[model samples]
Target: DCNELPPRRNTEILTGSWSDQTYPEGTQAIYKCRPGYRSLGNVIMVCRKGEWVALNPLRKCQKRPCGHPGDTPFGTFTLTGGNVFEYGVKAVYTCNEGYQLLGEINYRECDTDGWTNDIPICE
Candidate 1:
């Protein structure tokens, strides 16, 4: 059963990064949430010959979620991506309809494919 799946490989060796890649039919991939992060769906998957036959597409995480790159949220003005680098693109923050600014938490990347809240609360 275990051998039927694709061997766990590194990102550098796989496809340069942890991207959405298709595996053989009898093999698939499984990823683990990084520290301070938790997955919203099955962390693992399987393939059969070269097709990902398992796992949910609506994958998500719980931790440091953020707005889209250069979203320019409401009120105030801040850029999370410019601060947090560990999370990459899933950075997040909040703002009033027409506030001005606040603390630094205004932006933070999802270091481990996680989200700060249940919703994709971001611009």
Candidate 2:
């Protein structure tokens, strides 16, 4: 049997009631990937011999990648940081030679839910 287990990094229990503190032998805990992350392995943990044991290949949660940050009209955007627009990356917008920018900021960030700000406009 196993007692209540501590929270795991980047994961949350997805099965069974969390309020129950006692888990008998052969009990299982299914952990789901947290936001901004993707799972790479089995997330089930078993209670055996008074301890929580993981299945083979240990569960891994990798940062979820935010694809393209989108484009702007009459202007183009470029990644200011890394080549790939994954999480935490920034994109800078530039208006064409004759166009003018109409937004407060010319940059957007790749966040967990995708781009942080609206696409910049060029008028």
Q: Which numbered prediction scores highest in lDDT against the true structure?
A: 2
lDDT of each: 0.43, 0.70
> How close to the true structure is residue 32 of candidate 2, measured as C-alpha lDDT?
68
Off by over 4 Å in 2: 11-15, 40-42, 56-58, 71-83, 92-101, 121-123
For model 2 the TM-score comes to 0.62
TM-score for each of the candidates: 0.31, 0.62
- Give stretches of model 1 more than 4 Å off: 1-30, 50-52, 60-63, 66-77, 82-123
Q: Quickly count the clashes in candidate 1.
A: 20
Tens digit per residue, CA lDDT, model 1, 7-117: 342321111233344433544456554445445643555565454444544543434444344544343333354454334443444557654244445544454444443
